[PDB]
């Protein structure tokens, strides 16, 4: 229902103006990636899914889609002058994913669906710890991207 | 500034006396100025000259000037290299014809005024096999662009 | 004093060039590009800049005939000094010159964009090399006999003590089709312009010449001085209005 319910009725995910690509992603190879995350956050979460009621993952698995089709879509997402005028544009589109809602002052992608919550608590992000090692290029600084 | 210099300057008298242009006449060159300095330049030039000839007007005064032991010798003859190298040894004068742009590696040391000197000798190194270098040697090359 | 003797007018814009030359190759793992006209100095400020810091510079010779496996024997023989865990950071000059052909460029840039070209060396020949530097790793207090972290800590010395100059001249599209081709060079090393020299320089390399030369008043030295900077400077606008 979810997959059918989100590519027909919107015109807006298939609007060349609304979503702004960096390559010319074909509609078959974006259904792809969507059922691959979908498979590895059901095998993390299928134990959790049949302690939890039928309501509550209902909607755990159209939050899980939701999350799924985002990156699924998110990643492609990008060029133009600037790249956060093409993501507001596609964040304000996504932000209707029927029933399941977005908290607001925050990026679809910034934000990532939590069984046990059901907040959609945003990314946390380690606060960087200093290194001896002399390259600068071996430093890493986590980031919440 | 004020520096010690004759009331007349021009340079065609400093470059050459007014005998050796009574020569250049006899040897097929017009009496106007400008082709007498560019014909004073090339004898108290201290690099190779690159000369523009559209209607060869320049390499029939080169002929002129080089009466004997003159070889002309285009880049696109087979043994240019090995003529060159036997040249370089004991030539009076060589001219190279066509070369209108992007001047071959193997000319690059040639065309370079710096020579290395061995002991008494003077030693050149063009191509694979360094050639043995006379004093006295000219070097001309022609271009119709 | 001991390496070959280099002339240079050591004017203040040349000095300045050398000061951030000096910079690049202070910053460990980072690379130098010099970008200038053919005569800028820069092959002979490099290797000045080289020798006033803790650094040991070695160019390759090219030959009339020259071959890809010629070109990686004298690469191979520099990683070798450099594999040694007490040796001196090696420094590598190359121009548009040595450059004869554009296939002479491509282990250069894997090498320069990091650690070493693949398949440079044998596999067995690598394990000689990887035992040497387990010694230092023991000092060092990294761990050993791990196979992953050691053959890691290599790829960073090997990365830490190989310095990559390389010196181009950006007079044709050539250059710019490098750029395009070769992707590492751009990016991985750090870029450095030398502009024309001012004409407050120009003067100073004038009265450099003019010294060890007989004149009436030596008034006459350091007027021409100025001629000579005037001169050269007036060749430009008239180039420009030409
Ligand atoms: N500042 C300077 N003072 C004196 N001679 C110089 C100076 N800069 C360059 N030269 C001379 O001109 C040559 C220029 O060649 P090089 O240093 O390789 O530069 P490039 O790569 O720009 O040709 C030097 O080798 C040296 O003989
Ligand atoms: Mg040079």
Same mark, same amino acid.
């Given at each position: 229902?979810?997959?059918?319910?989100? %590519?027909?009725?919107?015109?807006?995910?298939?609007?060349?103006?609304?979503?702004?690509?960096?390559?010319?992603?074909?509609?078959?190879?974006?259904?792809?990636?969507?059922?691959?995350?979908?498979?590895?956050?059901?095998?993390?979460?299928?134990?959790?899914?049949?302690?939890?009621? +039928? @309501?509550? @993952?209902?909607?755990?698995?159209?939050?899980? %889609?939701? $999350?799924?089709?985002?990156?699924?879509?998110?990643?492609?997402?990008?060029?133009?002058?600037?790249?956060?005028?093409?993501?507001? @544009? $596609?964040?304000?589109?996504?932000?209707?994913?029927?029933?399941?809602? %977005?908290?607001?002052?925050?990026?679809?992608?910034?934000?990532?669906?939590?069984?046990? @919550?059901?907040?959609?608590?945003?990314?946390?992000? +380690?606060?960087?710890?200093?290194?001896?090692?002399?390259? $600068?290029?071996?430093?890493?600084?986590?980031?919440?991207? | 500034?004020?520096?010690?210099?004759?009331?007349?300057?021009?340079?065609?008298?400093?470059?050459?006396?007014?005998?050796?242009?009574?020569?250049?006449?006899?040897?097929?060159?017009?009496?106007?100025?400008?082709?007498?300095?560019?014909?004073?330049?090339?004898?108290?030039?201290?690099?190779?000259?690159?000369?523009?000839?559209?209607?060869?007007?320049?390499?029939?005064?080169?002929?002129?000037?080089?009466?004997?032991?003159?070889?002309?010798?285009?880049?696109?003859?087979?043994?240019?290299?090995?003529?060159?190298?036997?040249?370089?040894?004991?030539?009076?004068?060589?001219?190279?014809?066509?070369?209108?742009?992007?001047?071959?590696?193997?000319?690059?040391?040639?065309?370079?005024?710096?020579?290395?000197?061995?002991?008494?000798?003077?030693?050149?190194?063009?191509?694979?096999?360094?050639?043995?270098?006379?004093?006295?040697?000219?070097?001309?090359?022609?271009?119709?662009? | 004093?001991?390496?070959?003797?280099?002339?240079?007018?050591?004017?203040?814009?040349?000095?300045?060039? /050398? !000061? =951030?030359? #000096?910079?690049?190759?202070?910053?460990?793992?980072?690379?130098?590009?010099?970008?200038?006209?053919?005569?800028?100095?820069?092959? !002979?400020? #490099?290797?000045?800049?080289?020798?006033?810091?803790?650094?040991?510079?070695?160019?390759? /010779?090219?030959?009339? !005939?020259?071959?890809?496996?010629?070109?990686?024997?004298?690469?191979?023989?520099?990683?070798?000094?450099?594999?040694?865990?007490?040796?001196?950071? =090696?420094?590598?000059?190359?121009?548009?010159?040595?450059?004869?052909?554009?296939?002479?460029?491509?282990?250069?840039?894997?090498?320069?964009?990091?650690?070493?070209?693949?398949?440079?060396?044998?596999?067995?020949?690598?394990?000689?090399?990887?035992?040497?530097?387990?010694?230092?790793?023991?000092?060092?207090?990294?761990?050993?006999?791990?196979?992953?972290?050691?053959?890691?800590?290599?790829?960073?010395?090997?990365?830490?003590?190989?310095?990559? /100059?390389? #010196?181009?001249?950006?007079?044709?599209?050539?250059?710019?089709?490098?750029? =395009?081709?070769?992707?590492?060079?751009?990016?991985?090393?750090?870029?450095?312009?030398?502009?024309?020299?001012?004409?407050?320089?120009?003067?100073?390399?004038?009265?450099?010449?003019?010294?060890?030369?007989?004149?009436?008043?030596?008034?006459?030295?350091?007027?021409?001085?100025?001629?000579?900077?005037?001169?050269?400077? !007036?060749?430009?606008?008239?180039?420009?209005?030409?």
């Amino acid at each position: 229902r979810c997959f059918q319910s989100y %590519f027909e009725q919107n015109i807006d995910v298939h609007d060349k103006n609304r979503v702004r690509h960096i390559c010319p992603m074909v509609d078959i190879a974006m259904i792809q990636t969507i059922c691959t995350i979908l498979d590895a956050l059901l095998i993390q979460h299928l134990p959790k899914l049949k302690q939890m009621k +039928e @309501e509550d @993952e209902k909607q755990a698995l159209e939050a899980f %889609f939701i $999350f799924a089709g985002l990156w699924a879509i998110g990643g492609p997402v990008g060029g133009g002058q600037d790249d956060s005028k093409d993501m507001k @544009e $596609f964040n304000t589109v996504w932000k209707g994913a029927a029933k399941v809602k %977005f908290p607001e002052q925050g990026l679809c992608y910034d934000y990532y669906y939590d069984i046990n @919550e059901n907040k959609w608590n945003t990314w946390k992000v +380690e606060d960087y710890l200093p290194n001896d090692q002399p390259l $600068f290029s071996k430093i890493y600084v986590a980031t919440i991207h | 500034k004020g520096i010690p210099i004759t009331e007349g300057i021009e340079p065609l008298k400093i470059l050459t006396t007014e005998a050796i242009k009574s020569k250049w006449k006899n040897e097929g060159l017009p009496a106007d100025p400008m082709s007498l300095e560019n014909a004073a330049i090339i004898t108290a030039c201290a690099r190779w000259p690159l000369i523009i000839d559209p209607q060869l007007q320049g390499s029939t005064w080169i002929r002129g000037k080089q009466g004997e032991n003159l070889t002309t010798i285009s880049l696109s003859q087979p043994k240019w290299l090995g003529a060159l190298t036997s040249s370089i040894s004991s030539g009076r004068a060589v001219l190279i014809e066509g070369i209108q742009q992007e001047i071959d590696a193997t000319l690059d040391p040639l065309l370079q005024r710096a020579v290395k000197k061995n002991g008494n000798q003077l030693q050149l190194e063009i191509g694979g096999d360094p050639i043995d270098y006379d004093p006295n040697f000219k070097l001309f090359l022609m271009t119709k662009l | 004093e001991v390496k070959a003797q280099m002339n240079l007018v050591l004017f203040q814009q040349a000095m300045e060039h /050398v !000061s =951030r030359i #000096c910079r690049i190759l202070d910053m460990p793992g980072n690379n130098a590009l010099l970008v200038g006209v053919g005569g800028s100095g820069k092959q !002979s400020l #490099c290797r000045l800049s080289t020798f006033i810091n803790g650094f040991e510079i070695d160019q390759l /010779v090219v030959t009339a !005939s020259f071959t890809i496996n010629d070109l990686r024997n004298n690469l191979q023989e520099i990683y070798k000094k450099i594999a040694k865990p007490n040796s001196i950071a =090696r420094v590598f000059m190359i121009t548009d010159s040595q450059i004869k052909e554009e296939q002479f460029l491509i282990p250069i840039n894997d090498m320069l964009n990091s650690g070493w070209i693949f398949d440079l060396f044998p596999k067995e020949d690598m394990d000689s090399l990887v035992s040497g530097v387990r010694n230092e790793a023991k000092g060092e207090g990294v761990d050993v006999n791990n196979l992953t972290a050691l053959t890691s800590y290599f790829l960073d010395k090997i990365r830490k003590n190989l310095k990559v /100059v390389l #010196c181009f001249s950006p007079v044709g599209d050539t250059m710019r089709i490098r750029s =395009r081709k070769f992707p590492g060079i751009i990016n991985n090393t750090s870029i450095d312009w030398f502009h024309p020299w001012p004409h407050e320089a120009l003067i100073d390399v004038a009265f450099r010449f003019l010294e060890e030369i007989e004149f009436p008043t030596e008034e006459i030295r350091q007027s021409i001085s100025l001629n000579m900077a005037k001169v050269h400077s !007036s060749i430009d606008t008239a180039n420009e209005k030409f």
